[PDB]
Design a protein around this ligand. Structure first.
Ligand SMILES: [Zn+2]
Ligand SMILES: [Zn+2]
Lengths: 358, 88, 41, 118, 366
């Protein structure tokens, strides 16, 4: 053939293509061909492959310099941006080079293997140590304007997630998970610990829960909007612990308050917030049960001394209380068997040992 | 003179079979504490519980004439078919 | 021949029953090695 | 759909989409990474002719008998047809055809092969 | 008050009586019905569902006899509920008293359509043959009723002879009533009363006022219990004592004091009823059927130890303490002291015994 007249002709196109001066289809084929012609003369693939590899290696290794030291706003723009711009030309490199993928590589049954994969693989001399940490902290900062934050970095964050995933490895959901979901989650776990408690100092429990219930939905939404989905259950797991159980003690305490007042609406989103934590209800259930037990109690007393001498008023007094709380069981505690139980137990813990009897 | 006449009267009456209520159809002598066993051997801790009790198939008998006189295999003799306890 | 590559030509030799490869085996120098496993057997 | 095919020589063929989609070399550059005048500097029309139409027929997808008729031209014309399907990388046609390049060996000998392959 | 930790089910009971019993006017259908369900939501929580059991019948046993439970169809329903899930004992008895009271209604037609036949009788008689083995109504002393009853009593008694060659009868006197008339006072009165009342309230047609005994032998009911009824008539102002000043309520009562007729007797309005117990039996009512509860705690379990013993014949006494509750006591909560007492009873009746295998064993006889 002539490579000293052929390769360069193609290095240029591989270059041109990695800059999108938008080449006319007059070139795609012209290029593709070069390859096709090369790998036809069962090796005839190696060299070309060895050469391409460097082309990527260099270009990345000599464009990291444009990125290293980059800011956490400025850096994302840089990575995300360079990413799109890349995986794109990366792919279009495939076809111009596809002929090489299907035979020549096919014979490998080591390192040397596919191409689009390579591009990605090689970009992993632009993630592992370079921007990685860096790029993720960037993301972390932004996501942290989880405070009154600004709206578009979405592209900035999701952009990272993109490459962290498909970078997924490939060699021979980990990276994105090792590199990102690990820290992200971590940082998230602290953000809400500082917030939750500080909050519960100057505000109602039952004002907290609204802030509690809010963030869970909130972070649910963010996973959908721009983080990879695999990162949902867990985040829910983490934030839940943090915003509903750790505080599971103030709740246990406040609970008894509502029950005394009749703040159902509150009482209710509690049976909803706790519910989200493993067997964390045990107390509310035993707690509630103690309540209506005492309630049906004071209730029947407020009537009998010489008032038990009234058949109906009594059976009445009872049933009423029963109604209020059965009423609250369905509504407030979602007819959870656990509370109905507390309801029953407590009723059977008063209908039979009172001032009408003793 | 004076007078008040029964403008209107009403009534009720518990029933039974002919006349046997005076005995367990086993212990015929009177309506005291006999029940055979409790009258053949005095001095015990069972003669304190031998009042009057009824059934359902109409036969009339004491209170102790249930345990020491019955158990065998199925329903009441002569009048088998079915049986109900009740009447306490 | 000349025009026809190895990867391709080695595809033709793929629809031949092993024993047959003994016939092709001697057609000409090139055809010989090709008959030796590269994908076949 | 309506894609062009200005064959190496000069002719062009207002071809339908999926007609080209069988040729993986082109099915890529046209859909998400589309093109416009689809050049083929290696496969002339004289060749694409049979191609595009061979392609035409195959869209409804043990040595086939059908292709035996279409694939029954002098050697040279055939040993060009290997080279244009490999090019546009159309497995199918290559496969069949290819087989034919074998049926010239099915029941012959060394000097016998050469007596048709030189 | 009194030592009852199970007085509650008595209330849930006394309630229903209020709900059905003939109301001052009537219930709204749904109201009552819907209301009864409530009592049930209540009841299925009752610890000792065994007490509500008995009184409930003593309420009905009476509501029927007199027929003072309006909207019978209603009560016909409060059956249904009690049927479901608390044994099936209620299904046996209860309704009988309610269906037995029905045949009798047909029995009445046995006396009327036939009555026309050739059957003279000046009276508005209409008796209700009860199910002796049901209606807890006790009989004690024999009351004999004069004037205008021995014209029906034997008339019937005789009539009944007609349908049961060996049938016996016993008329309830602690429980039937009748209205009277006052062609002798300043105005006309329909003295509605009891049989025991009809009695002494009639001993004024003969020689003016008589004395306790002279008035006691007359009916020969039962002297102590007599003064009970008497004292009531006295509070009505029909039969007054010899001395104005007197707390007829509390006074006690003796055999040597006079009880005559208050020639006159004004009154608020006609058809005066008077059948509110002396006051004592309002008490007696309870105890008689109250301590009566004990008669089943224990009686029942001397046969209820085998019911589970079906698959038992060689057990250790460490095990049974409570193995008569889980699958049985679904009727009452036996206290800690009241469980070790009736066990001493079945040895003398050919039942369990202390198996001579271990210091803790039971030996069942069946
Ligand atoms: Zn006897
Ligand atoms: Zn006895």
């Amino acid at each position: 053939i002539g490579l000293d007249q052929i390769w360069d002709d193609l290095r240029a196109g591989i270059q041109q293509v990695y800059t999108r001066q938008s080449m006319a289809k007059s070139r795609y084929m012209e290029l593709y061909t070069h390859v096709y012609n090369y790998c036809t003369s069962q090796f005839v693939g190696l060299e070309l492959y060895k050469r391409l590899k460097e082309f990527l290696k260099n270009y990345l290794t000599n464009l990291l310099k444009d990125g290293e030291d980059l800011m956490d706003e400025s850096v994302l723009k840089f990575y995300t941006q360079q990413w799109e711009d890349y995986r794109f030309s990366s792919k279009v490199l495939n076809g111009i080079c596809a002929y090489l993928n299907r035979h020549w590589v096919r014979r490998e049954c080591k390192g040397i293997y596919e191409i689009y994969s390579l591009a990605l693989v090689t970009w992993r001399d632009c993630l592992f140590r370079p921007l990685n940490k860096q790029v993720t902290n960037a993301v972390l900062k932004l996501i942290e304007k989880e405070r009154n934050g600004e709206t578009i970095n979405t592209r900035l964050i999701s952009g990272v997630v993109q490459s962290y995933v498909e970078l997924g490895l490939n060699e021979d959901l980990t990276v994105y998970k090792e590199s990102f979901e690990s820290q992200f989650l971590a940082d998230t776990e602290r953000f809400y610990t500082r917030e939750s408690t500080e909050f519960l100092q100057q505000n109602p429990v039952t004002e907290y829960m609204k802030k509690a219930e809010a963030r869970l939905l909130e972070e649910q939404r963010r996973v959908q909007v721009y983080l990879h989905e695999s990162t949902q259950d867990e985040l829910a797991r983490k934030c839940e612990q943090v915003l509903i159980e750790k505080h599971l003690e103030i709740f246990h305490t406040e609970f008894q308050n509502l029950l005394d007042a009749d703040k159902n609406e509150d009482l209710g989103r509690m049976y909803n917030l706790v519910s989200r934590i493993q067997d964390g209800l045990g107390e509310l259930k035993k707690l509630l049960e103690t309540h209506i037990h005492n309630q049906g109690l004071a209730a029947i007393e407020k009537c009998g001394e010489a008032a038990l001498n009234d058949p109906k008023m009594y059976v009445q007094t009872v049933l009423d209380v029963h109604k209020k709380y059965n009423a609250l069981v369905m509504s407030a505690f979602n007819n959870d068997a656990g509370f109905v139980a507390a309801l029953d137990k407590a009723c059977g813990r008063f209908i039979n040992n009172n001032a009408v009897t003793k | 003179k004076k007078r008040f006449e029964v403008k209107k009267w009403n009534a009720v009456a518990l029933w039974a079979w002919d006349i046997v209520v005076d005995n367990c159809a086993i212990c015929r002598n009177h309506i005291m504490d006999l029940c055979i066993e409790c009258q053949a051997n005095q001095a015990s801790a069972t003669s304190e519980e031998c009042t009057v009790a009824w059934g359902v198939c109409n036969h009339a008998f004491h209170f102790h004439c249930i345990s020491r006189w019955l158990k065998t295999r199925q329903v009441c003799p002569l009048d088998n078919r079915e049986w109900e306890f009740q009447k306490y | 021949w000349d025009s026809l590559p190895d990867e391709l030509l080695l595809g033709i030799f793929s629809c031949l029953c092993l024993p047959e490869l003994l016939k092709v085996s001697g057609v000409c120098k090139r055809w010989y090695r090709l008959a030796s496993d590269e994908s076949l057997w | 759909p309506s894609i062009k095919l200005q064959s190496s020589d000069g002719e062009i063929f207002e071809v339908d989409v999926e007609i080209a989609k069988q040729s993986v070399t082109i099915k890529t550059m046209l859909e998400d990474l589309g093109m416009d005048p689809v050049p083929l500097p290696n496969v002339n029309a004289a060749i694409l002719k049979k191609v595009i139409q061979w392609c035409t027929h195959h869209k409804d997808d043990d040595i086939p008998v059908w292709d035996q008729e279409f694939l029954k031209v002098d050697q040279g014309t055939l040993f060009e047809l290997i080279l244009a399907a490999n090019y546009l990388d159309i497995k199918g046609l290559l496969d069949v055809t290819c087989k034919t390049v074998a049926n010239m060996i099915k029941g012959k000998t060394p000097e016998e092969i050469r007596k048709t392959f030189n | 008050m009194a030592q009852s930790s199970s007085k509650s089910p008595e209330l849930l009971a006394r309630y229903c009586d209020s709900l059905l019993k003939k109301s001052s006017k009537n219930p709204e259908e749904a109201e009552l019905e819907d209301t009864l369900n409530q009592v049930m939501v209540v009841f299925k929580y009752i610890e000792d569902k065994d007490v509500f059991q008995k009184f409930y019948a003593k309420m009905l046993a009476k509501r029927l006899v007199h027929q003072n439970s309006a909207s019978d169809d209603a009560e016909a329903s409060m059956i249904s509920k009690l049927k479901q899930a608390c044994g099936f004992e209620y299904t046996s008895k209860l309704q009988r008293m309610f269906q037995d009271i029905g045949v009798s209604k047909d029995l009445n037609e046995q006396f009327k359509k036939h009555l026309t036949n050739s059957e003279p009788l000046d009276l508005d008689f209409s008796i209700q043959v009860l199910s002796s083995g049901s209606w807890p109504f006790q009989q004690s002393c024999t009351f004999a009723l004069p004037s205008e009853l021995e014209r029906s009593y034997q008339r019937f008694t005789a009539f009944y002879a007609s349908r049961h060659s060996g049938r016996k009868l016993t008329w309830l006197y602690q429980l039937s009533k009748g209205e009277l008339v006052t062609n002798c006072f300043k105005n006309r009165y329909t003295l509605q009363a009891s049989t025991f009342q009809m009695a002494i309230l009639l001993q004024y047609n003969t020689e003016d006022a008589y004395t306790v005994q002279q008035l006691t032998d007359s009916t020969q009911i039962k002297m102590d219990i007599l003064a009970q009824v008497l004292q009531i008539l006295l509070k009505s102002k029909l039969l007054v004592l010899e001395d104005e000043n007197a707390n007829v309520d509390e006074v006690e009562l003796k055999p040597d004091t006079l009880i005559k007729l208050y020639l006159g007797y004004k009154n608020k309005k006609l058809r005066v009823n008077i059948n509110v117990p002396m006051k004592t039996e309002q008490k007696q009512e309870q105890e008689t059927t109250h301590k009566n509860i004990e008669e089943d705690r224990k009686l029942l379990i001397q046969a209820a130890i085998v019911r589970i013993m079906k698959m038992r014949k060689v057990l250790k006494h460490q095990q049974l303490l409570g193995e008569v509750l889980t699958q049985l006591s679904s009727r009452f909560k036996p206290r800690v002291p009241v469980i070790k007492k009736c066990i001493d009873i079945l040895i003398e009746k050919e039942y369990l015994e202390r198996v001579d295998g271990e210091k803790d064993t039971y030996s069942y006889l069946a």
